[PDB]
Amino acid sequence: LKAWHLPVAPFIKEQQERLMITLWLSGDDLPPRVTLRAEEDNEELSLPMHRLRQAPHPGVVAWRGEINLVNGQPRRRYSFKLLWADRQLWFTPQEFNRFPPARLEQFAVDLPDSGPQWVADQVFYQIFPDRFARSQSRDATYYHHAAGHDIVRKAWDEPLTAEAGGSTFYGGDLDGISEKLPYLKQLGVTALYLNPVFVAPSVHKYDTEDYRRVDPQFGGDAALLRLRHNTQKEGMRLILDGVFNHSGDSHAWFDRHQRGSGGACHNADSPWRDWYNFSPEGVAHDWLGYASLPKLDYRSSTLIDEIYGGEDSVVRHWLKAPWSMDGWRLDVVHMLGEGGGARNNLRHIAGITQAAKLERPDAFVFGEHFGDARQWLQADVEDSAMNYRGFTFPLWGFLANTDISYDPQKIDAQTCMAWMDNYRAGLSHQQQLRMFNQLDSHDTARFKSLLGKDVARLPLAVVWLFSWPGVPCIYYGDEVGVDGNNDPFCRKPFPWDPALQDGDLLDLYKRMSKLRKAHQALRYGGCQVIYAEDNVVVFVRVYKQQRVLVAINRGEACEVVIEDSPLLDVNGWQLKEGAGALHDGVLTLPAISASVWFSR
Amino acid sequence: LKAWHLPVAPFIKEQQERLMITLWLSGDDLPPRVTLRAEEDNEELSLPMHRLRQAPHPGVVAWRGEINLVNGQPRRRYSFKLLWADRQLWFTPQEFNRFPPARLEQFAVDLPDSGPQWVADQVFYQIFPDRFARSQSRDATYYHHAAGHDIVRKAWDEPLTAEAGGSTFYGGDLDGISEKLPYLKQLGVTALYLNPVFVAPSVHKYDTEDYRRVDPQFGGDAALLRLRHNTQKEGMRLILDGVFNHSGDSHAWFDRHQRGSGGACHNADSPWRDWYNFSPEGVAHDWLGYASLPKLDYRSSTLIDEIYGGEDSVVRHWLKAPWSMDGWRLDVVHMLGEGGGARNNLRHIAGITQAAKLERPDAFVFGEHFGDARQWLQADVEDSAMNYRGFTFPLWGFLANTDISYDPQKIDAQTCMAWMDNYRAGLSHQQQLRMFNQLDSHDTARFKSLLGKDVARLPLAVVWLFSWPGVPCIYYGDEVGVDGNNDPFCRKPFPWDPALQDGDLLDLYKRMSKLRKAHQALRYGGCQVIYAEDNVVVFVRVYKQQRVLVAINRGEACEVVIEDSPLLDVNGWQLKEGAGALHDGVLTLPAISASVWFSR
Numbered sequence A, B: 001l002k003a004w005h006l007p008v009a010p011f012i013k014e015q016q017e018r019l020m021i022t023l024w025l026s027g028d029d030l031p032p033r034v035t036l037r038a039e040e041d042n043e044e045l046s047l048p049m050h051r052l053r054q055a056p057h058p059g060v061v062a063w064r065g066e067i068n069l070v071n072g073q074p075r076r077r078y079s080f081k082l083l084w085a086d087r088q089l090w091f092t093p094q095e096f097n098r099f100p101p102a103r104l105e106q107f108a109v110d111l112p113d114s115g116p117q118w119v120a121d122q123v124f125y126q127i128f129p130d131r132f133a134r135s136q137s138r139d140a141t142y143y144h145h146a147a148g149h150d151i152v153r154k155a156w157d158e159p160l161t162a163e164a165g166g167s168t169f170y171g172g173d174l175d176g177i178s179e180k181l182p183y184l185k186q187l188g189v190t191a192l193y194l195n196p197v198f199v200a201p202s203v204h205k206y207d208t209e210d211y212r213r214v215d216p217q218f219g220g221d222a223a224l225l226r227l228r229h230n231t232q233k234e235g236m237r238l239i240l241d242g243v244f245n246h247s248g249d250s251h252a253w254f255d256r257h258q259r260g261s262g263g264a265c266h267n268a269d270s271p272w273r274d275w276y277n278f279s280p281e282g283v284a285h286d287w288l289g290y291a292s293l294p295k296l297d298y299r300s301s302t303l304i305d306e307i308y309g310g311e312d313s314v315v316r317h318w319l320k321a322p323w324s325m326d327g328w329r330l331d332v333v334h335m336l337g338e339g340g341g342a343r344n345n346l347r348h349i350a351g352i353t354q355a356a357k358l359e360r361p362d363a364f365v366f367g368e369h370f371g372d373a374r375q376w377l378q379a380d381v382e383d384s385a386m387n388y389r390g391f392t393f394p395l396w397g398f399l400a401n402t403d404i405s406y407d408p409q410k411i412d413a414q415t416c417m418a419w420m421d422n423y424r425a426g427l428s429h430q431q432q433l434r435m436f437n438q439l440d441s442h443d444t445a446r447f448k449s450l451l452g453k454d455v456a457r458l459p460l461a462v463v464w465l466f467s468w469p470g471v472p473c474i475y476y477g478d479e480v481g482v483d484g485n486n487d488p489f490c491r492k493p494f495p496w497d498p499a500l501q502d503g504d505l506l507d508l509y510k511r512m513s514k515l516r517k518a519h520q521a522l523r524y525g526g527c528q529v530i531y532a533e534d535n536v537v538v539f540v541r542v543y544k545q546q547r548v549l550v551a552i553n554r555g556e557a558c559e560v561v562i563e564d565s566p567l568l569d570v571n572g573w574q575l576k577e578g579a580g581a582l583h584d585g586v587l588t589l590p591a592i593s594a595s596v597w598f599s600r
Helices: A174-179 A181-187 A220-233 A301-309 A345-359 A374-378 A388-400 A413-425 A429-433 A452-467 A503-518 B174-179 B181-187 B220-233 B301-309 B345-359 B374-378 B388-400 B413-425 B429-433 B452-467 B503-518
Strands: A002-004 A012-015 A018-026 A033-040 A043-048 A061-068 A075-083 A088-092 A095-097 A107-110 A124-127 A191-194 A210-214 A237-242 A290-294 A327-330 A364-369 A384-387 A471-475 A526-533 A536-543 A546-553 A558-561 A573-577 A581-583 A586-589 A593-599 B002-004 B012-015 B018-026 B033-040 B043-048 B061-068 B075-083 B088-092 B095-097 B107-110 B124-127 B191-194 B210-214 B237-242 B290-294 B327-330 B364-369 B384-387 B471-475 B526-533 B536-543 B546-553 B558-561 B573-577 B581-583 B586-589 B593-599
Touching (some): A018 A075, A033 A061, A043 A061, A061 A075, A174 A220, A220 A237, A327 A345, A388 A413, A413 A526, A413 A536, A573 A581, B033 B061, B107 B429, B181 B503, B210 B220, B345 B364, B345 B374, B374 B384, B384 B388, B413 B536, B503 B573
Parallel strands (some): A124 A191, B124 B191
Antiparallel strands (some): A002 A018, A012 A018, A075 A088, A075 A107, A536 A546, B033 B043, B088 B095, B581 B586
């Protein structure tokens, strides 16, 4: 017995106020009845399915049902209940289940879809501002109170060292990014995610001192206005790093260093005393034991107003004119809450997202989730997450034998795809398409270094990043082969000298972004894993009549048989990237290779 | 490789402000390192585990770690990360996982536990009031507007018929329940769940007309005061059916039948016009197409105040003096919300539960969930659910070959236990202990009838109901062998004539409730499935040094080998119920039997 279904055309079709659902079956003992299990206002529904007269493909029987769209909530969950005379079988995102699937692990489609529909068309690039590029115009040192010393300035070619990593400035700025826009546009980028840029004494600037002013070191307000102009002119989106779980200790609201007289750290009568939590001993709650990062108490209704409740709260401030940013990356989204911990977290993240969409309906809001983000995403409190658990770490394990803790990891293609597909199953198709996928970031070792001796696998990761469902994000310098261990060493200055650039890797990035821009299935399509065993993964992206086939071989050269699949029943295939070869259901795969085919 | 862990003593121990966690392992290739993955304010933690010098049991190696309890949220999620030189393995509620478990499917313990700790000590009994018992004192007919006719009155021995089922009254009342308290106390009952009792024209009374007055047909306010007195006197708890997703069409707020002049159904200027949703055509939103049940629009802040927001809102009204009820069963909890659907549902159920605990901190609030309730329970918006998906339907399938839709079902012991254990894995140990388990209810066919020819299996269900984690609920008449098809036929009058009673079944219920009252592990203990194959299920309840072993055989007589388990390493076993026999790791099980053993 076999089944096929993806939450996209050709399997689904909106027609008037109905959502038509088609299921494919094949086998010797087909069920005489099939029930479409659907949901309306969380009530489970048993909807009839009828057999279609026309076989969609050789030996494939098609069933169809209808979800009424005039009532219910926009997210349409559904599964298939195969019924025989004596038994039943469920078909789900995770294949067949002998007992009923979890409600939150069904197929799901968002109709009407009110999410940021532009996100799926983007190629993102993440910039750690101090390390990307210096403007042509272009170093003032001051005293970092939270550190024990003045800040340090280094020249662009000075090696990175573990000393005073939070206080070493190489001096990149925002006009530097503006000046490098042609390079990013040649790379395929259509959108930027910036690490923090508001006034703060550290180099990374998660120790926010003023949420209303751009730090002069990066070029101040004028330079961020220019970047917004230039990006708009080039049709590029722009996302800022939003740090609302905690403030910096040098913020006026807290003011550890008594720069004023009404700070919360040293005055019980401070206007913002109840914006922070102080233990019985008086020790302020902070972010995981970093006293420079006092945690904000969202029990206080004035804090709620200042951050997201008010018309000119911080979240909305940068989304309206003249700033008109395209949204927010939410730092430490999972811990924000009341009383010094994550109490009431889901409610407050919902408030932040809601406030953003009030200012800009198409605003993109996604959270930093090193962990399992499903409960946040399943309650629709944010649009998306940095997909470490769903994308990053499965690739770390399958390709680099390591994990979030740099613990050893030995997982084969089966386990990797079971892992990746289990996580997506909790997400609607529209949510899957906007997951923020990257290979590494400013908070991890460089993927290239994590490969160690297996660095030849890096191109496989690059192809996968551009073809797995979700929006891909390049971490600055990845595309020219920057390596490094974790923070501080993952934040090297970008090597603008082409002699220090891997130009073959750079070209790979250019081509994959062209393939993605070219083919709807790489942006909008469903995704079916077709083969997952030992070293080989094969999956197809699916959208209307178009298909995109992707075959990854992490080891020695081999041949693999691909059984006849109705998803692969096409006129022919056109190889677009890689040296793989498909002929008569046999895939010839060179050692350490990834290949992409478009259907003709 | 083998592992054991349950979220209860002897595996966990609170000591000062620390939670100690112990893991058992056994095998030839044990991991030299084990990481306790825990959570603090949703941040994943890697905590060291150290090897204990003393083997807890033959050939079993013990590891221990500590969760710091002074910070974080009360629910403590955790899992075990086994680490070798080249690989890792996860140990979870669902055995070993090669890739990291879902955050929401870890072991979890609620510390500090603020739930209703009394619930785990109860035996519940559900009463459909019109059909349970007439008081000695003891019939007035009126016109049911939503029906097309006057109500109908029938004598106690008149057969049930499908005609006017919502309007046929046999006349049971609340003083009748008061008078039958000695019977319920002899049965083992310590708590009552009543179907609706507020003023409403139907016999089931989910068509609420007045949320502030007890229906005179059941004996009015005086009779419910007496039942509260008598139950208190006998140390019995009392739960009322709370119907807040919709009102009845005869409620004054709506008033389809113009009993007043300011109703919402016929006046655009009604004080409660915005308490209901009217389509573009003006058709009121209702409960699944029943116009007698107009749905309430929780967008309106006055409605929120009337139902749960206000000091004397409906939810709190019956929880304070003089009513002092012990909580609420929430009818159609999953659909309640704004705009004519389930919009903002989680938030409103949270408000209702919060309001209840404001009035009574130990109030028990649980929802009617025919479907998958995990998202409600995982967000702590209610204490518990009617556990149809986690308990009822697995037993319908394994024992009765049927399901929620009375579709055929063919699942073996493996699938049943995989199903039951997968659902619990999303629940903390404290949540599992208060799940509201029953075999049937006023909204299903009688389980005894569902068995058809296999009715000899019914005692197995009864033993299982009292030994699976959760609080058991008898549906009135089940204990003397009432049968019937679904609503209306599952609501027969209780047969008080002992000649019409299955006294052997009644005794079984008495003994199982005595076993539960007697043994802490049946109320507080963890639960490990030990054997699940074809017809046989064997599981042990675990609490400190005590064990309770339960063996269910749904088919012909057989013998089954039980490998040495450190959970079964005890002084000896004492058979308490059934004819099973355990000797030298071999379980001799008669056909269609269930057996219970206490450890000595």
